[PDB]
Design an enzyme around this catalytic site. Structure first.
Site, mmCIF file in Angstrom:
data_model
loop_
_atom_site.group_PDB
_atom_site.id
_atom_site.type_symbol
_atom_site.label_atom_id
_atom_site.label_comp_id
_atom_site.label_asym_id
_atom_site.label_seq_id
_atom_site.Cartn_x
_atom_site.Cartn_y
_atom_site.Cartn_z
ATOM 1 C CD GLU A 102 -1.768 -1.369 3.879
ATOM 2 O OE1 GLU A 102 -0.838 -0.780 4.466
ATOM 3 O OE2 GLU A 102 -2.771 -0.779 3.429
ATOM 4 C CD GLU A 122 -3.389 -7.605 -17.296
ATOM 5 O OE1 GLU A 122 -3.427 -7.611 -16.051
ATOM 6 O OE2 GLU A 122 -2.842 -6.697 -17.954
ATOM 7 C CB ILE A 157 1.657 -5.755 -4.603
ATOM 8 C CG1 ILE A 157 2.136 -6.258 -3.243
ATOM 9 C CG2 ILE A 157 2.392 -6.468 -5.728
ATOM 10 C CD1 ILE A 157 2.002 -7.751 -3.064
ATOM 11 N N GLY A 192 -9.037 5.273 -6.832
ATOM 12 C CA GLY A 192 -9.617 5.097 -5.525
ATOM 13 C C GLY A 192 -8.650 4.641 -4.456
ATOM 14 N NE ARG A 228 0.470 -4.612 -15.221
ATOM 15 C CZ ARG A 228 -0.450 -5.311 -15.879
ATOM 16 N NH1 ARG A 228 -0.616 -6.601 -15.621
ATOM 17 N NH2 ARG A 228 -1.207 -4.721 -16.790
ATOM 18 C CG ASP A 265 -1.765 2.578 -0.118
ATOM 19 O OD1 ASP A 265 -2.490 1.797 0.531
ATOM 20 O OD2 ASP A 265 -1.627 2.510 -1.358
#
Lengths: 488, 489
Positions: free
Chosen positions: A230, A286, A166, A184, A168, A163
Site C-alpha cells: 500500500e 460514522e 487505516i 476478512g 481508529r 498489511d
C-alpha cells in the site's frame, strides 16, 4: 519536495486558505471538534459546516507542548494540491500511481525522525492519557479517539506477508487501546492466527504522515515478498520510496518520517466493551452522518512504547465529514473508472463518489453518448459501478455537459432530463452497508435484514434520439480575467 | 495416445462409444447435410426435434468423392470435457486454470506441417474453390456455402509482433473469393483498417480442422506478447505441448501446422460485397439465438492465394449452430463470470451455466450457497456482477446449491416452489443486450429505444436465508445402486 507531514504543511502555506493555526486554548474533549465543525469539517456533518483550511490547535488544554491537527484531507481541492494535479483528475492521477508502484525501503534509525523521543510503557510514570491528547468528536463518544492510525502488521507464521490499513482506536487504559479489525482483512487473519496459538500480534500505529501515504493506503495493492505494498502508491506519487524503520519495542516496522508512532501488540484472548468507561452506548460519528453504536467485544492493543519526533504534531480528523470522503471516495472512483473503461472504452468521462454519501453510498457517473449504440450503455455503466463497489446505494447518470461535482447541476439534470416513470430503476434486496440506518426491515418490507437496501439508478442522460433538443444555452467563450482581475 | 490434432481427438472419442459415428450413405452438402445432423446432434436452439449426440463424419459427399465432412465435434459438454480430461461440471474451471498458465506456440518447418501435404495455388486458371472444398449450406435460404469454424491468424501490417487469432465464418462467393465478417474493435479489424488506408491488402490464414483444445481455448481472452499468438497458449497448456506453427506458402502469415485444411488469402482493400449476392435470399445464416440472420450488405472480400490441406483432408464445420456454439461461447462466459464473482464474493458462487437455451450468451444460471445471514442480499449482487461482466446476457436465474443448474426441469422447479412473482423478479429496462435477439426491438416494448436494447430480468429463486429450514428437499438415503442394476452403471 514533500516527504512527511510538515513539508506538506509548508506547501499549503504557499497557497493561502488551506492552512491556519490558532493559539487560543481548546479542549480536546468535544470542544475541538465542535470548533472545526464550523470551519472545515464538511461532508455529512450537520449544518452549519463547510470545507475550509486545515487547522492546527497549538494550545491544548491539559497538554502543554502538544499541538493537534485536523482537516488535512478534508478538501478535494487541498488533496489535489498536495499531490500536484487537477481536482477533477485526482482519482485518475492516484490510479495511475497504483499501476506503477515504488516499493518502500528500510532505513536506519538515524534517518527516522519519528524516534527522536522514546517513551517505554514499563516506566511507572507512563500514561497514554497524559502523553497524547486523543480528541473526542461528540460528548457521547465511547472515549478519546485516534482516527488516523496507519496500522502495519505482518503474518506471525510468515513475516513476508504484510498489511497496511487505516484504523481508529479508543484509549481505554494507561497502556491499552481498543481497535476494531474488519473481518476478512489480512491483519484480522494475522490476529486470529496469533490468538489461536495464544500469542500476541505486534503492530505499529503510525500517525501524522505525508497525505500521499494516507490516500495511497486506502487503495487495493498487489502482494510482493515483504510487501507493505500500500505504501508503494505514495512512493509512486512522490517518485521517492517511503522509508521504514524497525520498531523500538515490537517485532514490526514503522513509518520513519511519521510524527507519532504507538508500538504495541494485539493481546490474545481478551475483549473489551468500547464505551466501558463512558457508558453512552455509542462509539463515535460514522461517515453516513449518524452516531455509530459502541462495539461490545473489541480486541485490546497493549502499548509497549510511544516514539515521536520533537514537537510532535498529533494528526486526526473531525466529522469524519469531507476527510472521510477524500480517503474513501478516491478509491471508490478509481475502481469504478477502471471497471467501466475496461468494459466500455472511452464512454465514461468522470466519476464522483459524492460527499453526500461519504464517498461510498452515492455514485455520480458522467458519460458521453458518441453513437446510436451508446444508448442503453448508461445503464450498463451503472450496473458495472454497482457490481464493482457493492457498498454503493444509488447511481446518478449525467452527460458530459453536467458538472458532477456541482450538486446544483446534478439536481438540475434530475429536473429537466428525467421522467420518474421512465428514468428510475429500483433494485430491491441487494446487500449494501450496515451504517445506513434506512437499510432496515423497519423501513421497507422488501428488506430482509440490516444492511440490505433497495438500490436505485437515476438515468438523467438525454436519450440519444433527442440530444439535439437538450443543448444548453451556448454562451460565448471568453476569458473573464481582464474585466475582474481580482477574482482570478 | 496424446492429442495434438483433429484425428488424434477422433481416436479418443472412438474409445468412448456414443461420441463419434461415421456414415457411408451419400449426403448432399446443400441443406441435406445439416438437415440430417439436426435430428442426430445439432442440439442447442435448433428447432425440435433435435438433441445432442455423437459427432458425425460424412464419408460420402455427393459430387465430392474423396471428401469427408465433420460436424458436431464440440456439440456436447460431456464430449468437450472428455476431449480435455475433466468432468463436465468443472469444465469451465479446468480451461480457466489453463488460461492463467499458457504454453506459447512454436514455429516449425514444413517438414513437420501435415497441413501442407497438399498445396493448391490460386494462380492456376483451372483453380476453383467450389471444386476443392464441399462447403455446406445449413438451410436452403442461406446466403451461400459457409465455413463456420475458420481459425483466422493475422498480424499488424505495421508491427508484425502484434498478432490476433480468432474464429470467423466465411461465405463462398467466387472460385477465388470469400466474404468474411469482422467484429469492430478487435485487433484483426484494426489491422485491416491500417492496411486498407494504405491501399494494401492484409495477409490472413484460415485454419480449419483442429485440436478441440485450440478451438475452445481461442474463444477466451488472452494477453498480448511479442509474436505471441496468445490465444493458442490455452491449447498448449491444455495439452502440455506447444501448438506448432508453420510459415505460410503464398501469404505473409503463419498457419496451424497440425491443421486439416488451410486457406491462405488476403483482405482486398476498398472492395465490398453483400453476403447474399448470388442467392438473394436476404438472409445470411442461422444464428445462435435460433433464427436466420440477415445478410450483411457490406462485407470485406478475402481473395485466396493458396489452399493447403493434408492427405484426405477432413472438412470440419458446425450445424445449428446449436450446442456447438453453446460450448464455444458459453465456456468463456462462465469462466469470466466465475472469476468476477469469486473475486468480489469469495466462496459464494458454487457454479455457473451459460444455458444452451441462450446459445451460451443470453441466459445465465448462477448457483450460490448462503452460508451465513450476511449472505442474504448477496445473490442479487452476484447477478449484478454477471450482468456487468457479460453485457450480452439478458436474464439471470439464481438457485441454491441443491439445484442441478444443468437440468432444465430442476431449474423450472426452483422457479415454481422457490419464487413469488411479485417478490422475486426484478426488471431492468433499457440495457443494451444483443442485436440478434428479435425481441430487443422498439416494436416489442415501449421502454426499448433501439435495436439491441432489452429489459433484463433477474429471477431470484434462492430460498430466503430465514426460511432455509423449511425448504429442505426430501432426504433420500445415500446408496450405491450399482449392485441392483449393473447394466445401468
Amino acid at each position: 519536495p514533500i516527504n512527511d507531514l510538515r513539508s506538506a504543511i509548508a506547501l499549503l502555506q504557499r497557497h493561502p486558505g488551506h492552512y491556519i493555526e490558532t493559539d487560543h486554548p481548546v479542549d480536546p474533549n468535544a470542544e475541538l471538534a465542535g470548533v472545526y465543525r464550523h470551519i472545515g469539517a464538511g461532508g455529512t456533518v450537520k449544518r452549519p459546516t463547510r470545507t475550509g483550511p486545515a487547522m492546527m490547535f497549538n494550545s491544548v488544554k491539559g497538554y502543554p507542548g502538544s499541538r493537534i491537527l485536523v482537516g488535512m484531507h478534508a478538501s478535494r481541492e487541498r488533496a489535489a494540491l498536495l499531490l500536484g494535479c487537477v481536482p477533477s483528475k485526482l482519482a485518475q492521477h492516484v490510479g495511475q500511481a497504483v499501476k506503477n508502484p515504488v516499493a518502500p525501503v528500510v532505513v536506519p534509525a538515524s534517518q527516522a525522525p519519528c524516534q527522536e523521543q522514546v517513551f517505554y510503557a514499563d516506566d511507572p510514570d507512563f500514561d497514554l492519557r497524559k502523553l497524547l491528547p486523543a480528541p473526542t468528536n461528540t460528548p457521547i463518544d465511547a472515549g478519546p479517539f485516534f482516527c488516523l492510525g496507519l496500522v502495519l502488521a505482518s503474518d506471525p507464521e510468515d513475516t513476508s506477508l504484510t498489511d497496511v490499513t487505516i484504523h481508529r482506536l479508543c484509549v481505554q487504559e494507561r497502556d491499552e487501546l481498543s481497535m476494531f479489525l474488519a473481518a476478512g482483512r489480512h491483519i484480522e487473519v494475522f490476529r486470529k492466527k496469533a490468538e489461536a496459538a495464544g500469542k500476541p500480534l505486534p503492530v505499529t500505529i503510525n500517525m501524522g504522515l505525508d497525505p500521499a501515504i494516507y490516500i495511497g493506503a486506502c487503495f487495493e495493492a498487489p502482494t510482493t515478498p515483504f510487501g507493505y505494498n500500500e505504501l508503494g502508491v505514495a512512493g509512486a506519487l512522490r517518485q521517492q520510496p517511503v522509508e521504514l524503520v524497525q520498531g523500538v519495542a515490537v517485532k514490526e516496522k514503522a513509518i520513519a518520517r511519521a510524527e507519532i508512532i504507538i508500538e504495541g501488540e494485539l493481546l490474545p484472548g481478551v475483549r473489551v466493551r468500547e464505551d466501558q468507561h463512558t457508558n453512552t452506548g455509542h462509539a463515535m460519528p460514522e461517515f453516513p452522518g449518524y452516531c455509530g453504536e459502541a462495539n461490545p467485544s473489541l480486541p485490546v492493543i497493549k502499548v509497549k512504547a510511544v516514539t515521536m519526533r520533537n514537537h510532535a504534531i498529533l494528526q486526526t480528523l473531525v466529522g469524519p465529514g469531507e476527510e472521510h470522503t477524500t480517503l474513501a471516495g478516491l478509491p471508490t472512483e478509481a475502481s469504478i473508472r477502471n471497471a467501466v473503461e475496461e468494459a466500455i472504452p472511452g464512454f465514461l468521462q468522470n466519476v464522483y463518489a459524492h460527499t453526500a454519501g461519504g464517498g461510498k453510498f452515492l455514485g455520480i457517473l458522467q458519460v458521453k453518448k458518441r453513437q446510436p449504440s451508446d444508448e442503453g450503455r448508461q445503464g450498463q455503466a451503472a450496473l458495472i459501478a454497482l457490481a464493482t463497489y457493492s457498498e454503493l446505494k444509488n447511481i446518478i447518470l449525467v452527460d458530459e455537459d453536467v458538472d458532477i461535482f456541482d450538486s446544483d447541476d446534478i439536481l438540475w439534470a434530475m429536473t429537466t432530463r428525467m421522467q420518474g416513470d421512465v428514468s428510475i430503476t429500483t433494485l430491491p434486496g441487494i446487500r449494501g452497508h450496515q451504517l445506513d440506518p434506512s437499510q432496515s426491515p423497519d423501513y421497507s418490507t422488501s428488506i430482509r435484514g440490516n444492511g440490505i437496501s433497495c438500490k436505485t439508478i437515476f438515468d438523467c442522460t438525454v436519450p440519444w434520439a433527442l440530444k439535439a433538443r437538450f443543448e444548453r444555452a451556448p454562451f460565448m467563450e471568453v476569458d473573464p480575467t481582464p474585466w475582474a482581475p481580482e477574482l482570478f
